[PDB]
């Protein structure tokens with residue numbers, strides 16, 4: 001018989017055991033005879049007999065192991081079937097292309113009210129089960145989309161939101177408003193990175209709120225830590241926020257004239273990264289030459305199946321129009337973006353023998369004049385504010401004034417993003433709700449050749465939502481089966497709590513130590529990294545940069561960084577700028593300048609000075625987890641198929657790692673013997689009690705239940721009685737749902753089914 005043995009690029013490979021050794025097992029690869037390779041007994045797994053067949057729920061496999069899970073997903077993906085279940089947990093593999101019809105209004109309809117497994121695996125099925133559960137259990141529900149940057153969490157978040165609003169959303173205006181919020185938030189909070197062209201530089205929790213009649217009454221979006229660094233500088237293969245690029249590419253000649261824009265290369269805050277636009281043959285025609293940078297003219301447009309800076313400019317303006325933003329609201333946003341750009345251009349030169357600190361360069365006068373009109377400020381008030389920091393006024397050197405000009409741009413932009421999120425929430429408000437369905441789209445786990453505070457926070461976040469997973473799915477589920485007395489085989493796992501204890505320990509964790517450094521008279525990123533390593537050498541999720549597998553990082557000094565061996569893989573961090581990046585506060589000179597601005601819109605944005613970024617984020621996430629622990633949790637596991645952003649290119653070994661890190665290999669072991677559907681046999685009996693005859697009344701609840709299942713052709717293997725509740729095996733969700741249907745015409749109809757059974 002043929003088995004699954006390891007392969008370096010495919011993850012696994014087919015062949016049969018030809019010989020047994022003390023340490024290992026000699027395997028001969030299938031297709032070609034004679035040639036052999038050796039693999040360990042533990043590294044060898046049984047395969048399915050039918051290699052061509054695919055299953056919708058991995059729990060239906062003959063052999064439930066990491067090699068059979070990978071193969072099922074692989075086959076499904078080749079046939080363009082990106083969704084697969086592991087009981088009620090959905091695995092989504094990024095197609096990197098538009099699969100026709102699978103997100104159509106026809107498909108949306110086909111999924112409505114259908115039980116899990118009575119339709120193919122789909123995000124819609126996860127969204128509908130979460131709606132059924134809300135309506136039935138009278139308990140608010142949470143949808144958690146996980147995966148690394150490029151996995152497909154943002155697209156899947158959007159798919160679910162489109163399903164819910166189209167399905168259970170009135171038919172009125174509010175329904176589409178929740179949908180048109182994402183392209184607006186993506187304009188300001190999404191940017192081209194190397195892992196993803198449409199990367200989410202912020203985390204979000206979108207709640208769809210319902211009344212007791214289970215009809216949408218509005219929504220609420222929560223946002224988490226928009227990347228401030230990206231506003232000023234980027235790397236040649238990455239860009240600033242999409243808004244800058246859509247505006248430069250698609251603005252009417254009047255807007256270009258009014259905002260004083262030109263090709264991205266003229267702007268400091270853009271020209272360090274990519275100055276190329278997302279376009280095709282058609283759209284590249286629609287962008288005027290006075291917007292095209294030399295890089296664009298020499299190398300061409302950036303290619304993307306979904307992104308298009310021109311087509312997305314009109315599409316965002318149309319989203320603003322559909323959510324109630326008038327032409328004034330629109331321009332005010334544009335003036336701030338433009339103001340931020342011109343602000344960036346402002347350059348300084350050493351004064352020495354005049355003021356002491358520095359002045360503004362002679363060719364920075366245009367930038368200053370333009371920046372002032374857009375931000376409703378006096379040019380000199382601005383000129384003073386950037387060159388002299390009062391602390392009794394004090395002058396600033398060239399480097400210090402550069403830091404000042406960037407700090408103000410960052411705050412101004414962030415405040416515009418907080419305004420957009422707010423204005424978005426204002427387009428779908430409500431006085432009160434009963435239950436909600438919230439979708440969690442964090443910023444996915446990322447790492448590059450150079451990793452600072454940004455990555456440390458994004459990954460600390462990814463750590464937290466993975467801790468919620470271990471809790472809900474493995475710790476609590478096994479605890480239930482145990483408390484009820486089912487004797488399901490215990491599954492031990494690689495817990496990610498130690499990593500979190502390392503970061504957020506009150507007074508002695510990385511975050512509270514970093515805070516202490518900011519609070520010192522002369523802070524240091526070197527002194528910071530020292531105290532981190534000195535408290536107290538030992539910890540499994542921490543190592544000095546020279547201990548990295550990648551050559552690149554082995555040149556980093558002990559005090560210059562640290563590696564964090566995360567759940568999703570190890571990431572070496574360069575601790576430079578950590579202290580600075582941990583200060584959310586803005587000097588009061590710049591704070592007062594922008595607050596006392598002759599422009600209402602700018603004033604309205606703004607409603608030792610130190611504010612911890614890290615601990616503000618700890619607080620933010622801890623509120624979210626409380627919100628999350630109160631709801632019923634549903635999980636979507638997005639998988640990135642390759643690192644080349646291509647379709648029909650399944651990297652086996654790469655996906656296998658993702659299946660292992662997400663703990664889906666662990667879940668698969670527990671679902672092999674777990675019962676995902678369950679109900680109290682007394683509450684179930686009491687629900688039917690009003691319509692059952694004396695004969696059925698005299699019987700103990702367990703016996704009526706046993707008879708009702710034995711009427712709906714269930715099997716002794718399918719269900720199992722606990723101490724208080726009845727439990728149901730995977731692939732029996734359809735059955736479980738009808739058994740649980742609280743509708744009196746169904747309940748009484750089922751008593752008749754039972755009566756004839758005897």
Ligand SMILES: Nc1ncnc2c1ncn2[C@@H]1O[C@H](COP(=O)(O)OP(=O)(O)O)[C@@H](O)[C@H]1O
Nearest residue numbers: 096097149150151152153154155196198306444
């Ligand atoms: N289900 C999908 N269907 C089509 N394209 C997808 C899908 N999921 C992801 N993509 C592609 O991958 C890109 C990035 O996916 P995204 O949703 O932004 O992932 P994440 O937020 O997890 O990094 C999208 O712009 C799109 O081109």
Ligand SMILES: [Mg+2]
Nearest residue numbers: 153154199200
């Ligand atoms: Mg995203």
